[PDB]
Amino acid sequence: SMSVKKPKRDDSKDLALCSMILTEMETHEDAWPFLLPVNLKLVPGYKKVIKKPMDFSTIREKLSSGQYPNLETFALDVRLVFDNCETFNEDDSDIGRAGHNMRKYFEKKWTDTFKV
Ligand SMILES: Cc1ncccc1N[C@@H](C)c1cnc2ccsc2c1
């Protein structure tokens, strides 16, 4: 509270580390369904069903332009990518499988990088 400061982690490396994690995401062979925005004019239903579309290139732009206040808001957008994927795609499909794989891949890198 007021004048009662909690010790908090050094956050000076977070921007660089998040960029590093995102690069690893982008270069994963199963990243292809998530590299670019889903084309709202070619994919029926997507615009109406998915209220907050997100993809790696949008995340990269926001990261590079100071639009994440902290690492937690960055993680929310990454997870949003895979939550959207589950909403629109069957688990037993190429894209569906891709999503589960990429989520698992992210969460380990997240733990290994920041949960010291
Ligand atoms: C992640 C996702 N969810 C729902 C719909 C699309 C997509 N990916 C886009 C890139 C996409 C857009 N078009 C195609 C055509 C064959 S796979 C594929 C993938």
Curated annotation (Swiss-Prot):
Annotated localization:
Nucleus
Q: Which family does it belong to?
A: Belongs to the WAL family.
Any idea what job this protein has?
Regulatory subunit of the ATP-dependent BRF-1 and BRF-5 ISWI chromatin remodeling complexes, which form ordered nucleosome arrays on chromatin and facilitate access to DNA during DNA-templated processes such as DNA replication, transcription, and repair. Both complexes regulate the spacing of nucleosomes along the chromatin and have the ability to slide mononucleosomes to the center of a DNA template. The BRF-1 ISWI chromatin remodeling complex has a lower ATP hydrolysis rate than the BRF-5 ISWI chromatin remodeling complex.
Tissues expressed in: Expressed at varying levels in several tissues, whereas a smaller transcript was expressed specifically in testis.
- Organism equals Homo sapiens (Human)
Q: Domain Bromo spans what residues?
A: 9-113
| Description of how the protein assembles with itself and partners | Component of the BRF-1 ISWI chromatin remodeling complex, at least composed of SMARCA1 and BAZ2B, which regulates the spacing of histone octamers on the DNA template to facilitate access to DNA. Within the BRF-1 ISWI chromatin remodeling complex interacts with SMARCA1; the interaction is direct. Component of the BRF-5 ISWI chromatin remodeling complex, at least composed of SMARCA5/SNF2H and BAZ2B, which regulates the spacing of histone octamers on the DNA template to facilitate access to DNA.
Q: Shown portion of the whole protein?
A: 2054 to 2167 of 2168
Protein name per the record: Bromodomain adjacent to zinc finger domain protein 2B
